[model samples]
Target chain A: GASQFFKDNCNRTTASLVEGVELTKYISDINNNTDGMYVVSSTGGVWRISRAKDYPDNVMTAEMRKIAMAAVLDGMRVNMCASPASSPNVIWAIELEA
Target chain B: GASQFFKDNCNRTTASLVEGVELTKYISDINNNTDGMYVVSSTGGVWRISRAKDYPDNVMTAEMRKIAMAAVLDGMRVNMCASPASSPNVIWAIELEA
Candidate 1:
């Protein structure tokens, strides 16, 4: 029902990570392609997260929501990875309950 | 008195991330150059962290020490980013406590 920002975890190692940080909010600008799937966390942290160079709208929206779902629904922290210079960072969230 | 693994945060792009995760330990194999500064955390997380393609032992040691110091002395969490293909992740840690 959604788009995939990052293809998989094997591509996970290709990026650096922001491990175990709280996500205050996740924003997906549908009409705003420049800063589409993005987030801001604790102090001075803002990420424009993308994996593939080219992406479809619905799929992109879906993946962004998936990340937000983990944080909003479950109060889960995040594990984000920076992909490239153009579109920095991608979400590779490995979450669990206490 | 130590080496610098990552040149700067401006060079922070061109990598993915593992944000907001626990850093169990940071290891610097002094004489061991291949896997010099590395760490492991929450799950199946094993990182061979290096920002430079060719780093001096002392600088690498000190940079690695800085990361370990953050985790050990303060029990702070970590934020890691995966760099180029050869030297995967470089750490950019910003921490605080209650």
Candidate 2:
């Protein structure tokens, strides 16, 4: 009954979500790609956080950029949703820790 | 056992943790206090994020500043640990979103 990817991959339910995750790394415009971002946790988990390019508003993309800046430049952490199926897993929602 | 405050207030064990939390508001130098910050969530939860005034490095304090900047200026969200025992809550760690 949860986001199937998380249940099958991360062995967790998305409904409860993960909070206060410390991000040790964050990269924007990953590999010269503007459409996606990259992040890693202090615990060694890596993820690719991307959004639909043509999606209305593209607010999430902008939000990710800000978070990336804080992580890379300000030593900040992050909270997010991920799919453990993939190495450098896939993140659905990535937000700042506060 | 979890953090006593989160366990008693938020009803969260703090071991599994909550993640991907979005912050709808962030304010620095809260109430004329240069040593602290303030924030709010989309869910109407608010918190006062503070740190020890004499703590060396103060990196965490600076990190919160950046996260607050992103939340206020760049429209970024946040993830954090909080206490339900207090009004506006109390945050232990706050970090930027990816």
Error of 1 at B35 (Å): 4.8
User: Best DockQ goes to which candidate?
Assistant: 2
| The candidate that achieves the highest TM-score relative to the unseen native structure | 2
Error of 2 at B70 (Å): 4.1
The global C-alpha lDDT for each of the candidates, from Candidate 1 onward, is: 0.44, 0.51
Q: State in Å the error of residue A3, model 1.
A: 55
Docking model 1 quality class:
incorrect
Return the number of clashes found in candidate 1.
38
lDDT of 1 by residue, B1-98 (tens): 00011112313455544455567766667674464677766574666653434322223333344544455554555444444354334543221111
Q: Identify the runs in model 2 with alpha carbons over 4 angstroms from their true place.
A: A1-16, A28-36, B1-98
Query: Which candidate has the highest lDDT of all?
Result: 2
